Symmetry: C2
Subunit: 309 residues, 2 copies
């Protein structure tokens, strides 16, 4: 069995990130990581007619950057796993239609960036695909349509040697402790990130000392301190080992886990500044209906371990 | 490799449907198959306060039926694959929270019924899970919300594992998105046929098979209008299904969402009874949302297939 413990998949065959691509808007371009993205636009329309075509252009850009880096055509990919981080896959389905790659459509939450890589990894490791493409996108301009980073990240994975290996993934379970305040996203998502991180370490018999970095996505300032405290209650001390993507992309539930992980964290690993990193993307599973009814907001966090090859 | 041809996964290890569960509304109860569903309700609210709690109760019923028939508890399942037709985080997410099973959230479309089984199947065959639960649901009363601002009222769930059962799963074909330019939200049957045809053709080609190798080729929700088109398209590719084709949308009472409940309640019984030995089930989905319809964009469609056989 490749399932280790309760929720962690340990891949047994060689598995690598062969290339990645990122495309972002102006707010991201002006931030500390602005120069690391493959595409970065000076204005939010991304030279497009409207917001829909803007986000579609961001994903197409990110995907073509990833493919270009390996001189791959769309026909060279066996499976495509993608979803929007915010909307109802309005972008992902359009891009899938153009790529013509067999398509597994995932539900768009901020956890989708790692959910798509986890599934892609299992399919490649299980012999169901030679190469997989995983992608997600979001656009600040349309993030309101529930009752946010502007960008998209894509990765190409395969068993062919690359600078970064994927060694395990932990699938999260939905966690909902009550929060209904659509603006209290930090306090709602933290318990999910905590459960997934705790289960991952328990499953692999590891501690934060086995990681160079434990990176969360989308907890930002409010959620991070809560996550650390919750982990301490479980006897898990992340210490200075924890950082959040929402905290690195802008100067002094924003779906930024993918573009920061792909544009920045992967570069750090390939440069040998980080050897093993646990990345946990956390999503608030909501939408108009949920909020329209003042219901609690369920959250989920999925994790993936990347290591220098 | 388990990948065969371009888009077909052939499972190399023992893989079975251990049980299934279906829960439906009054309209389905009154239909020709009404007697085959595990649970049915006399009124669409299903004893619940609103349409959201109604659909949630239906999925909880179907999942509990599937689990109960095998004497399993929610803790006995390693992975849960599910989605619901509104994509409002209302049903599947709610049910996943209560079950506490590691959850892979799929985008709801009428094609999700087979997408969830295909992924579940690969994860089991790949050693990533011992048992998987897959479920989908829809409700007639909120079906309009996919387009704005005939759908089945029910839910089907299945428990899968390597433990011997009456029904084996031998392959699955993952579809690619096909879009020939149909904008009309109710010419959905015709927007979906091309996707269903592409998947059936590729599935047959990948495995070096013809319709003669199947006792039944069943499409999910093409219904009255889409079925003739599908057969015409397959013929244009030199594939003659003849009388081997049927559609779930024609057996329960397009974009109907009846694929899972008809397959689970009816088709599975036919296979276990020995009346059908190998069946290709292809669920077809129109990938849309109000944003799509609102801007009168063409409607992308996708079809995923799974082959079920008598053990």
């Amino acid at each position: 069995m490749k399932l280790t413990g309760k929720q962690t998949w340990e891949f047994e065959n060689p598995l690598f990130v062969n290339s990645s691509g990122t495309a972002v808007g102006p707010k991201e371009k002006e931030g500390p990581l602005g120069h690391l993205f493959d595409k970065s636009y000076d204005e939010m329309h991304c030279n497009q007619k409207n917001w829909e075509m803007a986000e579609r252009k961001l994903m197409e850009d990110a995907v073509q950057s990833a493919l270009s880096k390996q001189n791959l055509k769309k026909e060279d990919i066996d499976i495509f796993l993608a979803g929007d981080l915010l909307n109802q896959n309005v972008t992902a389905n359009y891009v899938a239609r153009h790529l013509k790659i067999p398509f597994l459509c995932l539900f768009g939450a901020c956890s989708t960036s790692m959910e798509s890589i986890a599934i892609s990894s299992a399919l490649i490791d299980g012999g169901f695909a030679k190469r997989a493409l995983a992608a997600t996108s979001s656009h600040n301009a349309t993030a309101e349509r529930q009752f946010t980073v502007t960008g998209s990240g894509a990765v190409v994975l395969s068993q062919q040697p690359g600078g970064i290996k994927i060694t395990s993934a932990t699938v999260g379970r939905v966690i909902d402790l009550g929060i209904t305040d659509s603006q209290d996203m930090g306090s709602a998502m933290a318990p999910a990130a905590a459960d997934t991180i705790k289960q991952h370490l328990e499953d692999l018999g590891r501690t934060p000392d086995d990681y160079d970095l434990i990176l969360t996505g989308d907890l930002s300032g409010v959620g991070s301190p809560i996550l650390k405290d919750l982990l301490k209650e479980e006897g898990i001390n992340v210490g200075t080992k924890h950082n959040d993507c929402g905290l690195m992309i802008y100067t002094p539930g924003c779906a930024c886990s993918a573009v920061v992980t792909f544009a920045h964290i992967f570069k750090e690993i390939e440069a040998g500044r980080l050897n093993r990193v646990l990345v946990v993307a956390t999503g608030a599973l909501l939408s108009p209906t949920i909020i329209q009814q003042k219901e609690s907001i369920p959250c989920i966090a999925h994790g993936v371990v990347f290591e220098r090859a």
